Amino acid sequence: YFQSMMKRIQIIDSHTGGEPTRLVVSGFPSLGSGTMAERRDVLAREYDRYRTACILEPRGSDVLVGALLCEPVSPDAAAGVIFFNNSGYLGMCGHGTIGVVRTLHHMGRIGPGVHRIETPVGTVEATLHDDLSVSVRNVLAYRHAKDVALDVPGYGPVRGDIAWGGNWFFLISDHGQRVAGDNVAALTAYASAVREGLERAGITGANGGEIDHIELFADDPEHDSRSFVLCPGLAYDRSPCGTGTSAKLACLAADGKLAPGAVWRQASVIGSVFHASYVQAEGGIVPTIRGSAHLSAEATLLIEDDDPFRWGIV
Amino acid sequence: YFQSMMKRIQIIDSHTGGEPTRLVVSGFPSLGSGTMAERRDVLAREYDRYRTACILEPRGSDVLVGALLCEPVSPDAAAGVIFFNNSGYLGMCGHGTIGVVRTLHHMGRIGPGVHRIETPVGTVEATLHDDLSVSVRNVLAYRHAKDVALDVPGYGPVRGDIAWGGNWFFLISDHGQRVAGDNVAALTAYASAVREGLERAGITGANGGEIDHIELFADDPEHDSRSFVLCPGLAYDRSPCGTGTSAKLACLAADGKLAPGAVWRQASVIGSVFHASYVQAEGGIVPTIRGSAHLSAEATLLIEDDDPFRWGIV
Ligand SMILES: [Cl-]
Ligand SMILES: [Cl-]
Ligand code: NA
Ligand code: NA
């Protein structure tokens, strides 16, 4: 019923292990009634300024990940979601699905139990536990290649795995870097160089898929592993990375290093933790990631018609 | 009347020429009834986690500047304000005062006209024009030293002025850098090195004042000048920088390059613009900065008691 000359975008912000999720409850344009993938294509092609308004400065930051709530195609699903970041659109998003599901509870839309969530890479099954933690049974994960040699410009040779966990990842253990929260500047520079190296080498996932997430793994006395993860827009993931941990489990499974049902405890560069396990499937594994999200803001974004930076600063 | 186990901070976000201001309307602790400077001391010493919760990730970003609304000491003032950023506390804040005053109009607390605003460095006089632009008559500005030689580590010799405009600035024209929005990475690195150089040299403002803002000036065919400004937490100012432009006018005045009452049009690295003029005063000049602010969000920040990152990620 408001009539002033501005758009209102209703959002609820949460974070999962420190990684933010900006849930868009209302205010984006219609994207039609097709699959989440088809809607993502319309959003990206026709209405990308809505992403930038929500994610980029002045209203956002390069770290943020957004989640657009959509009516799902199947009436058996709780929701559809399209995830996006400072550079573009994600496939699946583990930390974000945890955030969305926790947020839907706060909105009074769901209770504890199993909830199907449609995404541009397929439907996932999220269990909202009685403690309000969330387990996300992800799409199929698999390793495309193992121990791929790469000369990292400015640093020297490494070996990495290429794997899909709902996004494409390059996974490295022999990077020679110090994985710690006080070292994220150097880690960001290193991982950015890795990605430049993959591009130069023409190294890709299946069917030429761009490898746009980089994971650096390290031993951790308190957990199974700690990682630093560089995301497609060159911000790092504050969380253990749900899709990246899914990809890691595909590698561990294929190497006989983690049995089905066994729990893997993955820490992020800042010390937050996800619990993960998998079952075998045809062509890969089906991993489940469990973590917690906390609410951090309820807001209405205001997009004033006369504001030259209404769609963000690009 | 809410009773869930979380704190609520009510905020209204705006931006001034792209530079954000997060106005805190309610939710911070009591800081006593002294001057804004005395309240700032209490906030910084006892309750700094409230700054980090509002400004830092996950709820904020390194770019944000906050403004805490306070009841002023003098009943003749519209408001008192304490400004803060990702690293600490500012003195005056030009873009932020424009934001605060525009926001107070939106809140229905003031109308067009002249409004006194108390700050930790003295009271300023803001005029809210009928067009909702704001002129801020700043505190006294003055130049402390001219053409100070500095060997910038990694780059080579420059000359800069040291001046106060409500914060301390080093102002350089002969930096050899390209002042443009597509070059902010290199400008940030250069200005950071300048500041390292000042520290090494023991170069300060009056009474050993830390020079924590760096301004790089360039000619501009559309304006009097364009600048890149590095702020104390090493984020850059998206605006022309009200206090930095105030400092620039003190230098121009002292050099006989701008007459009292003449208008100076200062652009920022991303192309936003302030209009500035001054009058002579004892010991310096009194500059007035005019610009516009746009609303960008209304929000309640949620600080959950059980959220390990409730006070921000440090
Ligand atoms: Cl609009
Ligand atoms: Cl709390
Ligand atoms: Na361990
Ligand atoms: Na000019």
Curated annotation (Swiss-Prot), chains A, B:
Substrate binds at residues 94-95, 213, 237, 242-243. It catalyses: trans-4-hydroxy-L-proline = cis-4-hydroxy-D-proline. Its EC number is 5.1.1.8. The active site is at residues 93, 241. Transmembrane segments: none annotated. Keywords: Isomerase. GO terms for molecular function: 4-hydroxyproline epimerase activity. Catalyzes the epimerization of trans-4-hydroxy-L-proline (t4LHyp) to cis-4-hydroxy-D-proline (c4DHyp). Is likely involved in a degradation pathway that converts t4LHyp to alpha-ketoglutarate. Displays no proline racemase activity. Belongs to the proline racemase family. NCBIfam families: PRK13970.1. This is 4-hydroxyproline 2-epimerase 1. It comes from Burkholderia multivorans (strain ATCC 17616 / 249).
